[PDB]
């Protein structure tokens, strides 16, 4: 469902950007050094590089102007997300929801209400429990403590790692030992989602009926888990090499192993 999907990706991208700015507001040590490293990422583009950054910071280095405009950004973006979510959902409604078996379902559909309105209220409470359980019994588990120290533009902390949801990226950016390479690898580490739709070779729609693909799929998941962990670790042996591999393997499973297994599969059904 290409359109429903592509919007999805844009959405993800926005959320990613949104959290980034939100995180800087508290103006902690990370906030800062985070704000300093991430924006600096655009400085990888040649020509309009160093210059683009300037708007970002609103200066010649991170300072107030940055902070206030980030607050503006953060205040605004969410709404944009809510807006695109409308497009996302609106596109979806032209085709109906997909389904686990990957075959027509017209032959039997049911009203969202009360079948799914009820299924969801429950789903919501099943996820709400852990999330409250953390935010009520272990508030700081997922959060770095280094950020309890007011930003100091003079001292970058020794043990620096982004909040968990950015580790895989982090790991890849750290995998390639080149300003640009890292950036690019990064850029594509996510931008690749746009390709998934054109890398579909199986005659069937879901994996439910493709054990091969399935194994490869879970291999990818786990592959991701590692990359995350690797981001949690410092640049040293073995980690460096492990990171490097996992990245290669991430990109490869997506760009070559899926399409290749996908085809092979068909021939094994005699299509």
């Amino acid at each position: 469902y290409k359109e429903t999907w592509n919007t999805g990706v844009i959405l993800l991208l926005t959320l990613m950007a949104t959290a980034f700015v939100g995180y800087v507001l508290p103006w902690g040590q990370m906030s800062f050094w985070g704000a300093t490293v991430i924006t600096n990422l655009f400085s990888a583009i040649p020509y309009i590089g160093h210059t683009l950054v300037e708007w970002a910071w609103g200066g010649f280095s991170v300072d107030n102007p940055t902070l206030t405009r980030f607050f503006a950004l953060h205040f605004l973006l969410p709404f944009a997300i809510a807006g695109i979510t409308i497009i996302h959902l609106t596109f979806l409604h032209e085709s109906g929801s997909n389904n686990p078996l990957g075959i027509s379902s017209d032959s039997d559909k049911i009203p969202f209400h009360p079948y799914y309105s009820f299924k969801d209220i429950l789903g919501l409470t099943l996820m709400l429990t852990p999330f409250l359980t953390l935010a009520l019994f272990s508030p700081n588990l997922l959060g770095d403590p280094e950020n309890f120290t007011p930003a100091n533009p003079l001292v970058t902390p020794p043990h620096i790692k982004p909040e968990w949801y950015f580790l895989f990226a982090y790991a890849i950016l750290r995998s390639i030992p080149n300003k640009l390479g890292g950036v690019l690898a990064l850029a594509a580490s996510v931008l690749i989602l746009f390709l998934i739709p054109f890398l579909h070779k199986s005659k069937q729609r879901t994996m439910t009926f493709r054990p091969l693909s399935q194994t490869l799929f879970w291999l990818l998941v786990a592959n991701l888990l590692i990359l995350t962990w690797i981001g949690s670790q410092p640049v040293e042996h073995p980690f460096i090499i492990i990171g490097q591999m996992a990245s290669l393997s991430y990109f490869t499973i997506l760009l070559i192993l899926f399409p290749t297994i996908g085809t092979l599969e068909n021939k094994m059904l005699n299509y």
Partner: protein, 100 residues
């Protein structure tokens, strides 16, 4: 030797769409060609394909499968569509190369 055959048969039981009573061609993703083919299906063959799916869907919703004795067997699987499809495709392939 009987390798390919040995293989195919395995994969077939592997994918396991039989567990749901679905023939190989029931699980085909419906692109434009397939859509077209399905419309060319003889009244009954279609009404039958229909049931099978509306029945498989009912299963997936209940989370259950068919008792062992009602599963499709690799050799008794009828490719009721493969021929109609190859024709749609062979037909299309023409229109396309002819527009040059």
């Amino acid at each position: 030797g009987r390798l390919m055959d040995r293989i195919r048969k395995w994969y077939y039981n592997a994918a396991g769409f039989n567990k749901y009573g679905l023939m190989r061609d029931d699980t085909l993703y419906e692109d434009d060609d397939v859509k077209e083919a399905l419309k060319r299906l003889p009244k009954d063959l279609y009404n039958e394909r229909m049931f099978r799916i509306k029945r498989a869907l009912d299963l997936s919703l209940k989370h259950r499968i068919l008792p062992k004795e009602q599963w499709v067997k690799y050799e008794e699987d009828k490719p009721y569509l493969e021929p109609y499809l190859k024709e749609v495709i062979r037909e299309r392939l023409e229109r396309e190369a002819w527009n040059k």
